[PDB]
Amino acid sequence: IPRETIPFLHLRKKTPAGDWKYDRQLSSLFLDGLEKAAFNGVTFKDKYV
Amino acid sequence: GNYTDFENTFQKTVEPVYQMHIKTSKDIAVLRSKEWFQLDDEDFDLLNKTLTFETETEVTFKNANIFSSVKCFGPIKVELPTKETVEIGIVDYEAGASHGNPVVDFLKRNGSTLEQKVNLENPIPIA
Amino acid sequence: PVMADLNGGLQFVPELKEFTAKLRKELVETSEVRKAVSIETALEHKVV
């Protein structure tokens, strides 16, 4: 993820002002789980939806 | 008979030991209101302590109902972590023409005795 | 469109729910201790 660049898929975080900004860290975590899902795939065993 | 001998009339009991568990901060704030609750160390922390009041009350009379002089006094003890007791206070209530001992009236309501009788549901005839 | 902020700085007091709740605590606490001391001083004067 290049600096100064917001990815296309990203999570946000609520600032003390009340607004929701791009958060580098949260967004990283999400995109890594999304990378693993693309390679290994995701299980939903025991998930009730 | 008919006695009007109030000069030579008195009451000099040793009251039953009364204990208070100080749980809250509006229990400690009440005890600090009372003139008669002298502590040796005024800053002493009472919270979650078990105080026992070993109290005796001299009382002289002027009439059938009104007391000439009331006097309640005795050590205030705290139960330590080890369950040995230590003196950390004195009761020192003195009065003139009174209708009551407030110290014992306080400890009855806001405290308890060491033993508590509990009645069976039904009295059992023995014989 | 005009958006008028007639809120006098409450934006900036953070965790206003739990703040406001702490303030009500401190008034009640104080009122209750004071009212409990006042009840006992009446009883322990009524008795004398």
The residue type at A21: K
Q: Number of B to C CB contacts under 8 A, please give it.
A: 38
Q: Which chain C residue lies closest to B103 (C-alpha atoms)?
A: C44
Distance, in Å, from the CA atom of B87 to the CA atom of B78, rounded to the nearest integer, reads: 7
How far apart are the C-alpha atoms of B30 and C28, rounded to whole Å? Answer: 16
DSSP calls for B44-99:
---TTEEEEE--EEEEEESSSSSEEEEEEEEEEEEE-TTS-EEEEEEEEEEESSBS
Q: How does DSSP assign A1-49, residue by residue? A: --TT---SS--EEE-TTS-EEE-HHHHHHHHHHHHHHHHT----TT---
Are the CB atoms for B40 and B89 separated by under 8 Å?
A: yes
Q: Distance between alpha carbon C19 and the CA centroid of its chain, in Å?
A: 11
Helix (H, G, I), strand (E, B) or coil at C39: helix
Query: Per the CB < 8 Å rule, is A17 touching C14?
Result: no
In one letter, which amino acid is B17? V
Whether C14 sits inside 8 A of A18 (CB atoms) is no
Mark yes or no for CB contact C43/B105 under 8 Å. yes
Question: Residues, chain B, total?
Answer: 127
Please give the Cα distance from B14 to B56 (Å, whole number): 4
**Which residues of chain B have a CB within 8 Å of the CB of C42?**
none
Q: How many CA atoms lie within 13 A of C43 on its CB side?
A: 18
Resolution of the structure in the document, Å: 2.8
Binary contact (B25, C33; C-beta < 8 A): yes
What distance, in Å, lies between the first and last C-alpha atoms of chain B? 40
**B25 at interface of C, judged by CB pairs closer than 8 A:** yes
Residue of C nearest to A18 (CA): C11
- Cβ contact C–B (≥3 pairs, < 8 Å): yes
Tokens of A5: 């660049």
| Nearest C-alpha in A relative to C13 | A16
